[PDB]
């Protein structure tokens, strides 16, 4: 059980938190209200999006918020490759035992949430294999059998939703899909605020500019770094996408920004601050540290095309309409009057 | 699947119901006539009509009706894009396996309907294998092959040749009357209703439900500023506005109903007064149209056909709401 | 410290498994354990591989493999620094080389180090290794400097030492000469110039990104009437 996580830690995702509250918290909080309108509670919620966008964060946050919201709830986390045994037996026995225990805890009255992380490992598909081929049938049967129980809820997360076979994703079992998009400027500011806390030491030079107003200095710094990161400067060019009918596309870093990258930027800035206090003896943090962290992160992620995802390419090709032909990694006349 | 979808379940499709009856149930009462005449009843029904709506629901209804006539029922549903196994003839093997299972089911004396969906994605190719399997299953007249496709133009006419898939049936969008029908099917009389709205109808719950359904259908089928969902440009450049009446679908209406129920529950748990209000329906309509702006309309790919086939003319640019020109 | 070496065999991108081996079951376990349901400190995983493209994007996601370090081809100053590691004052030196420096071994060693790099990175006709034709059809003459490495430096030093040993065995004069280094470097370039495909595709991608043009041809630089 993972404690110490809540929706207050997650920033920039407002609609998705409300939706996950509606799908999970609301049926537990109100059951007779649902029965009055003959609205069956959603049984399955899947989370998909670019990597590192906060699927596991939302999962643990909702797991803790279900316990805190009620006026004893049990959260179960199980991974795919965990329920694989080299012997012919126990490949299916473990899953059936897990679901039987979930039903037992439901009978006890405590709501139970099962979290299937990295659903690409298992339940992906059976046709393309190039027994694992016998995992999704009994799992679907068990989910159909447990659907009648009101308090049982199944939660799944996956980076690649395409690899998952639609049979488990048909209306019924996995009826709810939630997409976690890459953060935008306001979401980036919220995420930065979630980490740039007033408890971190601040150098006297920056603090004096606000007459000791820590909150004003911190929020001004957050806005400044957000503006710096999302700016379309020539230094921010990341990729060149080529279309034969089209002239070409230009991709910046902001198109692949994520909360994990913001956290690493803050961590690198704090490391630079520690090195500064070791080398000069002046404690605190500076804006120059944040700018250097930003530029170092951009240079570090410049070479790797790792930031790109199949979802990102699908969005780009559904935006331009033309299939990509080439991707190039950008890196650094006359008589003008 | 459970044959739980009756004729009363589907509304606005009465002519479609009668066409399906003519295509399916008629030879059963005249099997001796075909046997005397040495004939072959047609077992091919191609249901081509609107996009995501209730097109597949008609297949669930004929299965239920056929279950009623012989008074145990199997419905083999296959999706089309997921059937594709592009690499090297794997898709042909999968089609053979599906038809072998259909033959095994036909061995038992239970009617089986083999339904294929989204067949416009596909069609020297897999088409000859499909035709061979259809010819092989033709001997099993109890098994009924039902195909669905939203783009009849893209479908290869080889499957449309006389013989196997002779019967083609067109499907339509939910009409205002059909919308009132479908709204009544979910908004039943057992749903709670507001006392203030009851004051307008002296406590007649059925009349109140009917009036509320009429009101919501009229508002959703109206040309107002609240129905700016789609803006259409043309080669001629006559920029026009589509309204919530267009692109209406039963599945979306069910989602609107679900969102309205959720909003009503929220209002009950917040304000305290139980019941249903037209504000809940309007908010559900707005939220569900905001959600539905995503699924069919990324607006660069495949939307041009998705609007041109229904409207009837190619549209150069679609949107969602040099120089020296004079 | 858990050191994963050659993270190409495992940690492969999910899917694209033309070979029947299934990487879609092992690498999710690594992703789940490295990230962890609960964050765990005091354990650092270090991964070294020369094929960064084949690695799955989820592994290289920041906050999971946040520290990323690229080691590049050495330049002239880096070449001198690497040579200083192998050419040490403890290595025997021929009397002729020590003669002009009046017994000061450090000056002779650093002079020889400078002389070797002076020709290794020199751009002359004899050092033209490869020629590349771009989409525009323009051609660039790449020298051995663009494909130089520390391993090449070590191989050159070892070949020079072997030549010195041969000279001592045959003639009987102890010591290592600069001409031995020149012979070693020219022989090493001749050996390595026969193979056109000796670098990973990342170098070609970097060249294409720098030039801005698509690479279509590679060539090795091995070598009707009325006339009065």
């Amino acid at each position: 059980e993972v404690p110490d996580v809540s929706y207050a830690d997650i920033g920039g995702l407002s609609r998705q938190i409300e939706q996950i509250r509606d799908a999970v918290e609301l049926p537990f909080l109100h059951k007779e209200l649902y029965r009055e309108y003959s609205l069956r509670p959603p049984k399955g919620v899947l989370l998909y999006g670019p990597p590192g966008c906060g699927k596991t964060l939302i999962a643990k946050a909702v797991a803790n918020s279900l316990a805190k919201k009620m006026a004893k709830s049990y959260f179960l986390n199980i991974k795919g490759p965990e329920l694989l045994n080299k012997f012919v037996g126990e490949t299916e026995r473990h899953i059936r035992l897990i679901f039987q225990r979930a039903r037992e805890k439901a009978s006890e009255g405590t709501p139970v949430i099962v979290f299937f992380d990295e659903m690409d490992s298992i339940f992906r598909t059976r046709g393309t294999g190039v027994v694992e081929t016998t995992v999704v049938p009994q799992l679907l049967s068990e989910i159909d059998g447990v659907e009648g129980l009101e308090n049982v809820i199944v939660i799944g997360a996956s980076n690649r939703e395409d690899m998952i076979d639609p049979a488990i994703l048909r209306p019924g079992r996995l009826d709810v899909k939630i997409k976690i998009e890459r953060p935008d400027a306001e979401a980036a500011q919220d995420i930065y605020s979630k980490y740039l806390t007033e408890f971190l030491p601040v150098h006297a030079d920056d603090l004096a500019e606000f007459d000791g107003d820590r909150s004003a200095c911190i929020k001004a710094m957050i806005e400044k770094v957000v503006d710096r990161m999302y700016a379309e400067i020539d230094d921010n060019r990341f990729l060149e996408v080529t279309y034969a009918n089209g002239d070409k596309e230009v991709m910046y870093f902001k198109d692949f920004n994520s909360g994990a990258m913001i956290q690493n930027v803050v961590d690198r800035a704090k490391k630079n601050a520690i090195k500064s206090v070791l080398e000069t003896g002046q404690p605190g943090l500076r804006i120059q540290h944040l700018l250097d962290s930003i530029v170092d992160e951009f240079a570090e992620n410049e070479d790797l095309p790792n930031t790109t995802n199949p979802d990102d390419w699908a969005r780009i090709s559904g935006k331009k309409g033309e299939r990509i032909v080439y991707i190039r990694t950008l890196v650094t006349l006359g008589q003008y009057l | 699947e459970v044959p739980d979808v009756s004729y009363a379940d589907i509304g606005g499709l009465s002519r479609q119901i009668e066409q399906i009856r003519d295509a399916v149930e008629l030879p059963f009462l005249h099997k001796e006539l075909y046997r005397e005449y040495s004939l072959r009843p047609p077992k091919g029904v191609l249901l081509y009509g609107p996009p995501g709506c209730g097109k597949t629901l008609i297949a669930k209804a004929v299965a239920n009706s056929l279950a009623k006539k012989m008074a145990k029922s199997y419905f083999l549903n296959i999706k089309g894009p997921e059937l594709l196994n592009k690499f090297v003839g794997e898709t042909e093997r999968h089609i053979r396996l599906i038809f072998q299972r259909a033959r095994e089911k036909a061995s038992e004396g239970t009617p089986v309907i083999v339904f294929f969906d989204e067949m416009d994605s596909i069609f020297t190719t897999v088409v000859p294998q499909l035709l061979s399997e259809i010819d092989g299953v033709e001997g099993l007249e109890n098994v009924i092959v039902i195909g669905a496709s939203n783009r009849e133009d893209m479908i290869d006419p080889a499957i449309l040749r006389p013989g196997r898939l002779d019967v083609k049936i067109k499907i339509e969008r939910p009409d205002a009357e059909a919308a009132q029908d479908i709204y009544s099917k979910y908004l039943t009389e057992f749903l709670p209703v507001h006392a203030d709205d009851l004051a307008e109808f002296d406590g007649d719950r059925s009349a109140c439900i009917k009036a509320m359904i009429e009101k919501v259908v009229d508002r959703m089928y109206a040309e107002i500023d609240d129905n700016r969902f789609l803006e259409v440009t043309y080669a001629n450049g006559d920029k026009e506005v589509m309204y919530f009446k267009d692109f209406n679908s039963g599945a979306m209406i069910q989602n609107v109903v679900d969102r309205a129920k959720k909003n009503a529950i929220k209002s009950v748990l917040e304000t305290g007064q139980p019941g249903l209000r037209i504000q809940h329906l309007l908010d559900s309509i707005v939220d569900e149209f905001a959600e539905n702006e995503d699924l069919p309309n990324t607006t660069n790919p495949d939307d041009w056909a998705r609007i041109s086939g229904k409207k009837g003319e190619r549209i150069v640019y679609i949107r969602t709401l040099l120089g020296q020109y004079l | 410290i858990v050191f994963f070496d050659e993270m190409d065999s495992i940690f492969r991108t999910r899917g694209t498994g033309v070979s029947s081996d299934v990487e879609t079951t092992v690498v999710p376990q690594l992703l789940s354990e490295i990230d962890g349901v609960e964050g765990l400190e005091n354990v650092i995983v270090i991964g070294a591989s020369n094929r960064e493209d084949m690695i799955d994007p989820a592994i290289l996601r920041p906050g999971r493999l946040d520290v990323k370090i690229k080691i590049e081809r050495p330049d002239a100053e880096a070449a001198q620094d690497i040579y200083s590691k192998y050419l040490t004052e403890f290595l025997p030196v021929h009397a002729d080389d020590l003669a002009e420096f009046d017994g000061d071994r450090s000056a002779c060693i650093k002079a020889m180090i400078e002389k070797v790099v002076d020709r290794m990175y020199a751009e002359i006709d004899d050092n033209r290794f490869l020629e590349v034709t771009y989409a525009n059809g323009d051609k660039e003459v790449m020298y051995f400097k663009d494909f130089n490495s520390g391993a090449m430096i070590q191989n050159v030093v070892d070949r020079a030492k072997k030549n010195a040993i041969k000279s001592v065995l045959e003639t009987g004069q102890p010591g290592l000469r600069i001409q031995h280094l020149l012979d070693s470097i020219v022989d090493e370039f001749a050996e390595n110039e026969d193979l056109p495909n000796t670098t990973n595709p990342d170098d070609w991608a970097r060249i294409s990104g720098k030039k801005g043009e698509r690479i279509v041809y590679i060539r090795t630089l091995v070598t009707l009437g009325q006339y009065l």
């Binding site: 080299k86 012997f87 012919v88 | - | 033309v18 070979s19 299934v22």
Partner: peptide, 17 residues
């Protein structure tokens, strides 16, 4: 349009006498 070659994964099996 390509061909594949299979690598098997042995499953555990044990018997007594």
């Amino acid at each position: 349009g390509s061909m594949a070659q299979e690598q098997t994964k042995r499953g555990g099996g044990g018997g007594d006498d």
